[PDB]
Structure formats: C-alpha cells, structure tokens
Amino acid sequence: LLRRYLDYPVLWKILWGLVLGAVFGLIAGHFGYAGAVKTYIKPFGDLFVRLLKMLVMPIVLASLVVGAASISPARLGRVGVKIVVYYLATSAMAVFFGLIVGRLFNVGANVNLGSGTGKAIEAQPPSLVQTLLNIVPTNPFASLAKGEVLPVIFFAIILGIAITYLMNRNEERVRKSAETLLRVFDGLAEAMYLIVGGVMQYAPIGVFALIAYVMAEQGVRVVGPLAKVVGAVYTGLFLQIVITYFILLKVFGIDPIKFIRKAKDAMITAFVTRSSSGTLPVTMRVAEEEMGVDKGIFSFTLPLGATINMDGTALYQGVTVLFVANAIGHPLTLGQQLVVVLTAVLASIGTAGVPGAGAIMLAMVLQSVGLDLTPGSPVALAYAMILGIDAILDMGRTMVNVTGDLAGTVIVAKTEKELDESKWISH
Amino acid sequence: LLRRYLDYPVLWKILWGLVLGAVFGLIAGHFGYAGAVKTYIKPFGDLFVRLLKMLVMPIVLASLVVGAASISPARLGRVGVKIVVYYLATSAMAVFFGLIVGRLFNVGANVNLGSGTGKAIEAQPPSLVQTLLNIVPTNPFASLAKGEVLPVIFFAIILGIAITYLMNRNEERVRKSAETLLRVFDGLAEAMYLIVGGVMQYAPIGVFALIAYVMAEQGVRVVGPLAKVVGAVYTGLFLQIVITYFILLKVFGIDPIKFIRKAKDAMITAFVTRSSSGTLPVTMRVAEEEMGVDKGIFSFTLPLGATINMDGTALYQGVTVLFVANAIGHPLTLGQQLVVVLTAVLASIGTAGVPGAGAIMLAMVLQSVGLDLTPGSPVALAYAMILGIDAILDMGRTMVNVTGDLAGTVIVAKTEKELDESKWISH
Amino acid sequence: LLRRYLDYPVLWKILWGLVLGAVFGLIAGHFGYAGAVKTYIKPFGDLFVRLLKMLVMPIVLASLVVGAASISPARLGRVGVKIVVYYLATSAMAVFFGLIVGRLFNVGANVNLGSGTGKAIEAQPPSLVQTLLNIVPTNPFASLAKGEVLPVIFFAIILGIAITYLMNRNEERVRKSAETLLRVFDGLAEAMYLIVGGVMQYAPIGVFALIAYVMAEQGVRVVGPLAKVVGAVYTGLFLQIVITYFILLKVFGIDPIKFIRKAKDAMITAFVTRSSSGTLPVTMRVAEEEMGVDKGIFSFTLPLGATINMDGTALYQGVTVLFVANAIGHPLTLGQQLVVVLTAVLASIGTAGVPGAGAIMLAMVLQSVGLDLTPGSPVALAYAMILGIDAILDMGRTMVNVTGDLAGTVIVAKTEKELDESKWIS
Ligand SMILES: CCCCCCCCCCO[C@@H]1O[C@H](CO)[C@@H](O[C@H]2O[C@H](CO)[C@@H](O)[C@H](O)[C@H]2O)[C@H](O)[C@H]1O
Ligand SMILES: CCCCCCCCCCO[C@@H]1O[C@H](CO)[C@@H](O[C@H]2O[C@H](CO)[C@@H](O)[C@H](O)[C@H]2O)[C@H](O)[C@H]1O
Ligand SMILES: CCCCCCCCCCO[C@@H]1O[C@H](CO)[C@@H](O[C@H]2O[C@H](CO)[C@@H](O)[C@H](O)[C@H]2O)[C@H](O)[C@H]1O
Ligand SMILES: N[C@@H](CC(=O)O)C(=O)O
Ligand SMILES: N[C@@H](CC(=O)O)C(=O)O
Ligand SMILES: N[C@@H](CC(=O)O)C(=O)O
Ligand code: NA
Ligand code: NA
Ligand code: NA
Ligand code: NA
Ligand code: NA
Ligand code: NA
Ligand code: NA
Ligand code: NA
Numbered sequence A, B: 001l002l003r004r005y006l007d008y009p010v011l012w013k014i015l016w017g018l019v020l021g022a023v024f025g026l027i028a029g030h031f032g033y034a035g036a037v038k039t040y041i042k043p044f045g046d047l048f049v050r051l052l053k054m055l056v057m058p059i060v061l062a063s064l065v066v067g068a069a070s071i072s073p074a075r076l077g078r079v080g081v082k083i084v085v086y087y088l089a090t091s092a093m094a095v096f097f098g099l100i101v102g103r104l105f106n107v108g109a110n111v112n113l114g115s116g117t118g119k120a121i122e123a124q125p126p127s128l129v130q131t132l133l134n135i136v137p138t139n140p141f142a143s144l145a146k147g148e149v150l151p152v153i154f155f156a157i158i159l160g161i162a163i164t165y166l167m168n169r170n171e172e173r174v175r176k177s178a179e180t181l182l183r184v185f186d187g188l189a190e191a192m193y194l195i196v197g198g199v200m201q202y203a204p205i206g207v208f209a210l211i212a213y214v215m216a217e218q219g220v221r222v223v224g225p226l227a228k229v230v231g232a233v234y235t236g237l238f239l240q241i242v243i244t245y246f247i248l249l250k251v252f253g254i255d256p257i258k259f260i261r262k263a264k265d266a267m268i269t270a271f272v273t274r275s276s277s278g279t280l281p282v283t284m285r286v287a288e289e290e291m292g293v294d295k296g297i298f299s300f301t302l303p304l305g306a307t308i309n310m311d312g313t314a315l316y317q318g319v320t321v322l323f324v325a326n327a328i329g330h331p332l333t334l335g336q337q338l339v340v341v342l343t344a345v346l347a348s349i350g351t352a353g354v355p356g357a358g359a360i361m362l363a364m365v366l367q368s369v370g371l372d373l374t375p376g377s378p379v380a381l382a383y384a385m386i387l388g389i390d391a392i393l394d395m396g397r398t399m400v401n402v403t404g405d406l407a408g409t410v411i412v413a414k415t416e417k418e419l420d421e422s423k424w425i426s427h
Numbered sequence C: 001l002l003r004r005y006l007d008y009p010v011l012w013k014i015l016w017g018l019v020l021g022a023v024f025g026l027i028a029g030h031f032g033y034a035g036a037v038k039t040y041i042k043p044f045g046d047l048f049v050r051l052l053k054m055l056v057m058p059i060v061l062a063s064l065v066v067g068a069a070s071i072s073p074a075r076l077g078r079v080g081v082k083i084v085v086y087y088l089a090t091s092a093m094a095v096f097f098g099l100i101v102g103r104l105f106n107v108g109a110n111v112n113l114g115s116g117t118g119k120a121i122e123a124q125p126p127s128l129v130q131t132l133l134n135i136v137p138t139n140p141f142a143s144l145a146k147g148e149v150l151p152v153i154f155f156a157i158i159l160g161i162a163i164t165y166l167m168n169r170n171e172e173r174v175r176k177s178a179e180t181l182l183r184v185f186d187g188l189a190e191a192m193y194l195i196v197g198g199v200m201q202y203a204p205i206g207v208f209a210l211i212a213y214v215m216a217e218q219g220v221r222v223v224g225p226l227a228k229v230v231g232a233v234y235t236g237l238f239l240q241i242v243i244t245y246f247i248l249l250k251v252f253g254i255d256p257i258k259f260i261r262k263a264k265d266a267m268i269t270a271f272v273t274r275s276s277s278g279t280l281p282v283t284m285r286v287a288e289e290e291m292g293v294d295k296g297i298f299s300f301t302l303p304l305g306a307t308i309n310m311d312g313t314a315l316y317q318g319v320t321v322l323f324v325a326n327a328i329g330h331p332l333t334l335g336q337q338l339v340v341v342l343t344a345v346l347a348s349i350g351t352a353g354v355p356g357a358g359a360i361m362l363a364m365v366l367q368s369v370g371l372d373l374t375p376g377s378p379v380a381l382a383y384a385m386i387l388g389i390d391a392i393l394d395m396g397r398t399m400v401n402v403t404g405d406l407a408g409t410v411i412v413a414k415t416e417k418e419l420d421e422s423k424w425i426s
C-alpha cells in the first residue's frame, strides 16, 4: 500500500481523505468511540499539523525578504492600500451575510432563557495603540522565536527594501554582499516551498485524521437549536464565496470556478487544521505554483491576510451574536445590529490565526451590544452553547478566512499585472 | 503643515524637537494636561524607540563579526586593554565630579529627616563570578532572542576571528565558504546601517514626544531640594563632558568641539531614550558615518561600552548618595566618600543600558556606605524622593553614558590609527 | 606563566588534568576543604562547560545541513536503520552487564531496611505518542533558542535533503541561490569545528577543575555499601567497553586500541562534564579530525546517539535497581530482571543528555518492578542513597554513553564505506 497510496492522483486524494475522515468521524460519534479516534487517529492529524507549523516562520520570513526586494517600495505601498481596501470591504460584507442568514434561520429562538436589563460592568477597552506599536518588533530574533507573524512581516519588508537600495549603490563590494544575503533568503525560501510539497503527500492522512477526530467529538452535538446555528453558519460562508468572491473575481476578470479549483488545498487544510497561520505555507504555495501570483505580492498579502482578514470569523460572530440575543429574549434592535458590523470586523481583525481564537473574540462583540459575560448569567449560558460546537464552526470559518486571502491576492495581483496568465488557460 | 517639515534642513532638525518638546512638555504638565501628553503625544516617541530597538541585535551581531574579521586578535586584544583602561579611568573621574558638585550644591540639606544609627541587613548573597561567567553564552541563539548584548559580543568576536583563519586556508572550498558567510554578515550589517539612517529622518518627531512626555510628568517635581539635586547632577554631567572628555580628546589631538558636533544624534537619542542599548544603532552609525572609526574598533568598544562604561550613572550615584546621606543627617565621612568612588564605578558597570537601572543599582552604593533601604526607614524615604525625579536625571546621565563610549572609541581608534583623519578637516 | 602552558602538546595534557585533578580533589575531601574547591577552583571548570555549550546548536545545525545534503536520502535511511539496531542492541547488552556485574558485587545486601509491601503510586503514566510528535518542531527558531537538539536534527536533515534536490534543477538562479545557502552553513560548521579546537586548549584546566570538585564533594561518600555500587558500575562500564564494544569493534575490522586512543578527548570530556549533549562538539570533532568519519554520518548518528543511545546509563540503572531491591530485603525475581532490560533500555532512551538525568529516570525503572517512591518509605530511602553518590556514577556512565555513540558511528561508517583509512593505517 505504498504504491497504492502514492500513485493515485493527489487532487482527489486529499479530498477522499476529508470525506472518508468525516464519515468515519460521524460513525464513531453516534456509536460512542470518539476516545479511540482521539488516541489512534488524531495523532496522525497532529503530526500533519506540526509539519506545517514548522514551515511558517522560515517561509514567511524568506519569501517576504525576497519579494519585498523584487518590487519598488512605491508599488508595495500601492499593493498595501489595495489589499486593505479589499480586506475591510469583504469583511464588512461577511458580517452582513452573517446577520441576514441568522435572521432567516431564526437562530436560538427555541432556547427560551430569561434575562433582565443587563448588569452594569465597566468596559475594558481593550486598547488599540499598543496593538499597532507591537507590529514593530523590538527584537526580531525574539519575534522569530515567539512565532509572531505581523512583526516579522514588518522586519522582513524593511530588510528586503534595504537590500535592494544597497545593490544599486556604486561600490562593487556592497553589491556582492547584499546579493549574497538575498541569495541566502532565496535559497531558504526555495527550500521551504519544496518541503511544503513533500508534506502535502501525507496530507490525506492528516486531513482524514483531523476531520475524523473533530467529527467524532462534536458530531453528536449538532442536534437542537445548535443544529440551526451550524446550518446557518455554513450557509452564510457559502454565500461569501459564491456571491462576494465570485462576483468580485468575475468583475475583475478571474474565472471564479478556476480560482476555487486551484485554491482547494489551501481550503481543505484550512478546514481541518482550523488555523490560518498554520495553513499559511499551503496558501502561499498555491499562490505561487497554482494561481501564478508573483512572490512580490503573495509574500506580503497572504501572511498579513492570515491575521487581519477573516471573513469567516467575522461572519461566524455575526450569526452567533443574534443567537445569544435571541436565546435570552433580548433580540438585537436594528441600530444594535449595525454596531455589530463595526465591532465584528474589529474582532475578526484581532483574532489569531489559530484554532478557537474567534469564539473568544466573540465576547468583545457581545459586550458591544450590551450583552455581558457575567457568570452565571443567561448571556454567559448561551455563550457556552456556542462553544460546544466551536470546532464544527471553526473548520468552516478558517476555510473562508484563508480563501478570502487568496481571492484578494489573485484579484490584487491581476490589477498589478503580477499574475501569470499561462496558469489560467484551459487547453 | 506637513509640507514644510522635509524641505527644512535635517542637519539640526533633531535638536528643535528636543527644545520644543522640552518646552511643550513643561507647559502642558504645569497646566494639568500632563495626562493629555501621555495619551496623544507619547506613542510617536514609543514608535521611535521600537524602531531603534529592533536593530540592536542585528547590527551588533553583524558589525562585530565583520569587524573582528577585519582586525588582528593581537590588536583587538590591545584595543580591549586600552578601552577598558580608559573606561574605568573616566568613570572614576565621574564619581569624583559627582561628590564635588554634590558637595558644592549642598544637596539635601533642607530635608531634615533625622534617622538613627543604622541596621544590619543584606539579606541575600551577591555574586560577581557568575556575572563574568555569564559573558560566555550557553546558547547564542537564545542570547540573541533575549537581547543580551555582552554574550553576543563574545560569540561574534569568536566567529569573526574564526572566519579569517578559514579564509587564509590552503583549500579553495573552505576559503569560498568562509568568504560567503562573511558576506552575509557584511550584507546584513550594511542593511542595518541604511535603516538607521532612514529612521533618523523620523527622529525629530520621536525626540519631541519623548522629552515632551518626561517634562510633562516630572517637570512639576523639580521644585524643592530635588531641584538642587537636578542642578547638581546636570552641572556635574556638563563638567564630565567639558573637562574630562575635552581634555582627554585634546590631549590626544581630536578637536573637542567637532567631536560633540558629530556625536549629537547619539547624544540626543541617549538623552531622550534613556537607554544606551536602544541608542546603540544611532551611536554606531555616528561612529561609522561621522567620526570615521573603523568597524574593527567601534563594533567592539561601543556595544561593550553601552553596558560597562557609564560615567553618567557613576556621577549620578555620587551626587545622590550625598543627597541621601545629608537628608538623614548622617553625612559621609571622607573615607566613606571615597568608598562611593569604588562602589559607584562597580554599580555603574553593572547597571543595564535600559531606562531606570541606575536608580536600582543606587541601592548597592548606599548599602556600601552603611545606608540601608529597610522600610520605612528614613534612608528608604530619601531614596524615594530621588526616584521621583528619576526620568529628568536619567535623560542627562544616559547622554553622558554613550558620549564617553564615543570619546573612548575615537581616542582608542586614533592611538591604533583606525581613525580616518579626512573627516575632521573642512573642505 | 601562561606562555609555558599553552605551548605544551595536547595528547596527554587532558589526561594530566584528569589524573592530577581527580587526585587533588580526593585530598580536600578527607581534609574538609571541599567548600574552598567549590569556591576557588570550580568556576574554571564551569567556564569550560559554558564554552562547549555555546557550540552545540551551531555545530549540530550547520554540520547536519552540510552532511545531510552530501548523502542521498536513500542511503541516509539505511544509516538510520543500522545505527538504531546497534543502539537498541548495545543498550540491552549494557543492561545485561549491569545485572551481571551488579549481582557479582552483591549490591546493597547489607543495608537491611523494612520495607514491607509498598503502597502504590498509579501515576504518572508514561507518554510516548506525544514524546514522538514533539520531535517535529513547530518553530525551528524556537527549537534553536530553546536548545532542543532532537527537533533541530529533524529540521536540519529535511533542509539538507531539500538543498541537494535544488542544486540539481535547471534554472541557474535556483542552483545558484541553493549553492549560496549551502556555503553559509558550510562556512559556519567549519568555523565551529575550528573554535572547538581552541577550546580544547583550555580543556585540561577545565577537566582538572570539574573532576576536582566532584572528587571533593562525593569522594568522602564512597565508604559504604555505596562503595560496592561505585565498584560495580565502574566494573560494568569497563566490561561494556572492553567486552561489548571491543568485540563489536573487532568483528567489523577496527583496531579497538586505536579507537580508545582517538576517542579519549570525548571520553574524558563526557566523564568530567557529565553531559552527553554538552560534550557533542568534542565528540563530533574527534569524529571528524581523528576518526576520519564523513560529516554525512557522524553529523546524524552522534547528535541522535547523544540522546537515545546511552549504554552507561542503561547499565547504571541495571546496577541500582538491584541495589534498591536488595536493600529492602525484596531481591528481584528473575522475571523482574527481564522487565528491567526492556524498561531500562526505554528509560535510558528517554534520559536527557544533561547531568543527573539518569537518577531521575531511575524512578521509572523502579516503578515498573513494584518498587515505588512513596515518601518516606524504605524504597525512597535507598533511592536517596543512590542519589548521594550520583556524580561519581554520572562521570563514568556519561563516558560510556558517549563512547558507545562513537563506536556505533565508526562501525556504521565502515559498513557504508565512509571511513578514511589513512588515519588508521600504521
Ligand atoms: C509520515 C509522513 C512523512 C512525510 C513524507 C513525505 C514524502 C514526500 C515524497 C514526495 O515528495 C514530493 O513529491 C513531488 C513529486 O511528485 C515533488 O514535486 C512537487 O514540487 C515541484 C515544485 O516545482 C512541482 O513541480 C511538483 O508538481 C510538485 O508535485 C516534490 O518536490 C517532492 O518533494
Ligand atoms: C512606520 C514607518 C515610519 C518611519 C519613517 C522612515 C522614513 C525613511 C525615509 C528615508 O529617507 C532617506 O534614507 C537614507 C538612509 O540611508 C538617508 O540617507 C542617509 O544615509 C545614507 C547612507 O547611510 C547616505 O547616502 C545619505 O547621504 C545619508 O543622508 C536620507 O537622509 C533619508 O532622507
Ligand atoms: C590558560 C589556557 C588559555 C587557552 C586560550 C584558548 C586557546 C586558543 C588558541 C587556539 O589554538 C589552536 O587553535 C586551532 C584551531 O583554531 C587548533 O588546531 C587544530 O584544530 C583545527 C581544527 O580542529 C585544525 O584545522 C588544525 O589543523 C589543528 O592543528 C589547535 O589545536 C589549537 O591549539
Ligand atoms: N481558527 C481561525 C480563527 C478563529 O477561531 O476565528 C483561523 O485560524 O483563522
Ligand atoms: N539609563 C541607564 C544607563 C544607560 O541607559 O546608559 C541608567 O539607569 O543608569
Ligand atoms: N548525564 C548523563 C545522563 C544520565 O545521567 O544518565 C549523560 O549526559 O549522558
Ligand atoms: Na475581508
Ligand atoms: Na485570513
Ligand atoms: Na484575525
Ligand atoms: Na568611564
Ligand atoms: Na555607555
Ligand atoms: Na553598566
Ligand atoms: Na545502545
Ligand atoms: Na549517548
């Protein structure tokens, strides 16, 4: 079964692993075996997750030094402004789809909890200007060691920009030393992309195991008003792809169906690992060897988008806030639901690219409409129900969190003529 | 208003931010708006500090590998003996000015606290040998990530010395691989020096906010006998520059007025950041692109000096120990006043290159003459007053801390003739 | 004068430091000055340990990227299979001598404690599947900074393998950039081996000071039934070298006496520092410039062996399980002594390469045969006696731990035709 596994096409092999993993997970769940999946299956998932985690800092660091030196700082800034306008725009849209979809499913209207005028609590802000200053690393080695992507993006861009100015200086010796430094990062970056390719041969096993574990643990839990939550959240995400991404893709002259075909590996590992950051190496390699995007773009947009652009998380928080407000019988007035638009965008910007991060940031969004997490209050009680299904919901939103990054990257890269069109012609 | 800032000459621009920040802070603080300074002004300073901090480890590491490869270990060792002989010599001189000036200002004679005969406490053993053994890093990657300058100095010197012996090898491949590695550090260090320059275009703004905030918070507290302390410390610091450094520079045939002219960016950044380590990239760049010192000198002396050479701190401990001993009515006998000379030199050596460290190390100087920090005893109370004005005193003392590093580097480089004499003529 | 010491040939000079150092330390122990040794001598030994520590991550990372890129992955796996088979074989064999040598000395039969039937700790469970998974680093920068050797071995091997495939591509640019990167690691590894050479000029002093402090503290403490332990462990370790290693070395056609002659720098450094990982740069350098092994082998086997292959530790735990069981009047039945073989091998595999780690993992071996560490029970009382002499036993067992790694590396390297015979030709 070494020849039987490797020769079968890898397009449909990661997908075979997902489907069979999900059913295997569901059968283990109704029948009560989820503990064995956690023992004898999940480690294979865990192994696959680690192999991807291992590549994030080198590949983000090296691709961005190389990419930032490959494009004038004038265009880099132009790429920054565009991707951020794409990012906030599609994120706002995601919160919009969240609320509409939630109203249509009448989420949490059968929960029937009582409540009262909320308990007055002094709101911690939490404070933004420190969040921005912390983008600037004080010790870039420590940032590498602590795995901080956003400060590393900052150092990487700075060094890459500095390297080019040096290679154009008059003194021959400065040119060769700067080139030598750039080749080291290029050699490392080319070596990282290569290793991502080898790991993706194990991905069906890891994907199978990851989905098997999640489906066995939390499948039993999608039953009641939570089933209505799960069904709403996935409906909304779909619309964010099918309307927002496709229309935006089609408007800019990218075939949406070819985009989804190329993006799938980024989408499926985003799904089972439920970490945008942990999935980043797959996303970037899709951008290079599938989408045809230049390293001078996706080396910036993708690691940045993995953190600040989450349409999936933004939409998941839209749906569930309505759940809590309906579960306690204090439905959100229309003027309240507009505040959600602003504060969900912010919360999704601020969630980490790691499993579970969005459900915690949901609390900030609840506190913004006047629903406080005071234990053991009924608002705190509804919030607990949402946490029960969180993995089931995390898979979906992590996938849309990463997909929107690719859709934006390909769209921005097209308008900059850094997209390689030979990769999109059908034959 | 943003359109006149760039065209105005960037020669002295960093000094206007210093004065106008000092004046703006003194006014806003006296009006009870010192809180507004802290909110809307200080972050621009905090940004200028982070951008400099991010460069300390890369630039210290890369400049010292490159420099140590460019010089003979016999000479470097000789440079070591010279710079260390200069370092403690001028520090001893600084404690001397502290005591004289402090006596001249009769610091703390209006305090009138009235303590009794001292109490004996340690209560913990101090350790010097471990302090030396800690010069040798156990994990140089860990040392980089923890931002420990002296273990990096040790490892970098070794790697640089090692590279040249490899480039002198009889085997073509070993020469080429060592050449390749040296070009990496050279390319990296050249990129760090470029970035320090770009940051310094922002330095006026960063300088303005830092001074503004310090003046706003602590301006109001320079009123009582603490004003006499402030006046003594700055008078002494002035003398350390004007007598010790000028005579030493002039004895060795360096123009003192031109020296202060080149050092100003380092001097003002030390003043406002109150961190020798954080100012190091500005200091080293001053030493490269202003003084004309070779990397074989300043890439060793300057990071070393940022820790072990503090004349400013040594003198601040002279003045303030006299303040505390006079404030409690137990003035220092001359033989105690001589112990301060030795123990401030020791305390200044062991003081970190980061804000506030010398006021902690002050405690040891007190415990050496018999003034113990037992709470709530009067020694602990006088010490507390000194901490109240500490930022105002840190700005001055940090500036003299790096200035002596430059003066020693320029003097040492001259005696070894790695100082480039073409920068000090006008043509 | 410094100028006289530095010019004396280092062949036997590290040995003069060990021999004079051990003797010196013994004198202060009977004479009650061992506190002054800890003060005015030991810092020179501790300095020698820090300088070797600073080279471990650079030399392991750089040598293995270089080495792993110079050998086909197909062959690297075969090195892996061979060295692991040697490792489990010789580790078991070491535990076997541990029991033979240990019963021969009748260890701890005069102690005469209670103990009665013990009370049972059913916690903690050993965790493996995780321990294996953590071999894959999640952040290689984090692994370097935290000094985690095994994940760095994993990352470096992967990177070495990838660099080679890259130098084989069509585009000049990919060839050229991958070539550039390889040379950086090549320059770095070559610089590390050089610096190990300089540190070995200080090593006689460091060796003197380390063994002096150990003989000074724990010298007074071999008077008892513990003296029989010191004698057994050292007897066994000796047998592990002269029987197990020598017969194994000779089968494959390596002169055993030349092996000990070249290995001595690593053996004495493992002995005094009591850290296999701390001694690694000497071990790897002895392997390069003395044994003549290629970086494509010793850069893998030696860092891997520094953790998972400990024959000294395996034989040490064999000896002391018998000590504890006889001390309480519950001598080990034969079937218990078979469990030890499996579980001492497992425990030795899991023992860290740092001082004292083997006495801690000893608890895992006792806990397998029913001798439980519940305080203040008599079993816990015997274990305390073993910890009292632990340094004396650690010096010896760390040496056999490192010696076995070299013997395995040289044996495997011969069967792969990577050993350079001009170093062995008389
Ligand atoms: C227990 C789990 C342990 C993990 C086991 C990993 C086993 C990996 C073996 C296969 O390795 C990859 O397979 C592809 C060969 O089919 C190669 O081409 C990949 O990379 C090239 C990049 O240019 C592309 O051209 C190719 O299309 C793309 O498939 C890729 O280099 C190679 O490394
Ligand atoms: C959050 C982001 C906000 C931070 C703002 C940073 C602004 C950066 C703008 C850079 O501007 C130029 O950079 C050069 C730096 O290299 C300077 O040249 C200086 O440095 C070069 C070499 O160091 C020399 O060629 C020049 O003569 C010398 O003036 C030059 O003056 C400066 O105008
Ligand atoms: C109070 C004690 C003071 C101790 C101070 C520290 C001494 C540092 C001086 C370095 O001395 C030499 O360094 C070489 C390495 O740089 C070594 O050459 C040897 O080692 C190299 C690598 O192993 C080979 O290239 C050489 O050919 C080989 O002769 C050699 O052994 C060693 O003497
Ligand atoms: N797990 C999501 C974040 C979230 O929980 O919302 C991600 O990695 O993108
Ligand atoms: N500011 C430090 C010294 C320095 O930063 O140079 C002190 O407290 O004395
Ligand atoms: N200190 C030993 C481990 C042990 O005590 O077993 C070594 O490093 O090999
Ligand atoms: Na978005
Ligand atoms: Na994202
Ligand atoms: Na986010
Ligand atoms: Na001084
Ligand atoms: Na200084
Ligand atoms: Na200091
Ligand atoms: Na073994
Ligand atoms: Na070992």
Ligand code: NA
Binding pocket: C306, C307, C308, C309, C310, C347, C348, C349, C350, C351, C352, C353
């Ligand atoms: Na082990």
